[PDB]
């Protein structure tokens, strides 16, 4: 009802259409990417500095670190939105790695529509310090995008890219895409 064909537009990048959205996966360093939103996978305190979160906070810089801990004290947040700091993005959305991944991605998509943003880049949320299983994480991320498309919600969002630190985790995402393809 929704899925196109899996192909490779550039070495190590794989893509398919999900409705009108181009969904891509690649291995590499997410802090090198340009997108309207970059997603950080962090702790319930929004102050983790391990794995992906270490790279994101170091390169985004101290003003983003401070914005996070200011919002964390204000209220109980499922996620928080900051500026992009010295990353190549307009905003960073910091999600909790241990939370339901489908719910986290659904929230990211809705926030991007609210800002009329077109591009998103995320890590394999939950596979770092939270130790969620890669197969379950891939299924959840792609399910969130399918649900968004099915509800007719895709308007401004055109591209969703997962940049994955470990090549072995990329292989799991690729297999999940092949299972779904038209
Ligand atoms: C999962 C992941 C993703 C990325 C982009 N980096 C790391 N590790 C890391 C290594 C060295 C520094 N300085 C910072 C972070 N880990
Ligand atoms: Cl994580
Ligand atoms: Cl990752």
Curated annotation (Swiss-Prot):
The gene is PARP14. Coiled coil: none annotated. It comes from Homo sapiens. This is Protein mono-ADP-ribosyltransferase PARP14. Residues 10-181 form the Macro domain. Interacts with STAT6. Interacts with PARP10. Interacts with PARP9 in IFNG-stimulated macrophages; the interaction prevents PARP14-mediated STAT1 and STAT6 ADP-riboslylation. Induction: Up-regulated by IFNG in macrophages. Down-regulated by IL4 in macrophages. Auto-ADP-ribosylated. A glycoprotein 3 binds at residues 29-30, 41, 52, 126-130, 165. ADP-ribosyltransferase that mediates mono-ADP-ribosylation of glutamate residues on target proteins. In contrast to PARP1 and PARP2, it is not able to mediate poly-ADP-ribosylation. Has been shown to catalyze the mono-ADP-ribosylation of STAT1 at 'Glu-657' and 'Glu-705', thus decreasing STAT1 phosphorylation which negatively regulates pro-inflammatory cytokine production in macrophages in response to IFNG stimulation. The chain holds residues 1208 to 1388 of 1801 of the full protein. It is found in: Nucleus; Cytoplasm. Expressed in macrophages. It comes from the Eukaryota. Belongs to the ARTD/PARP family.
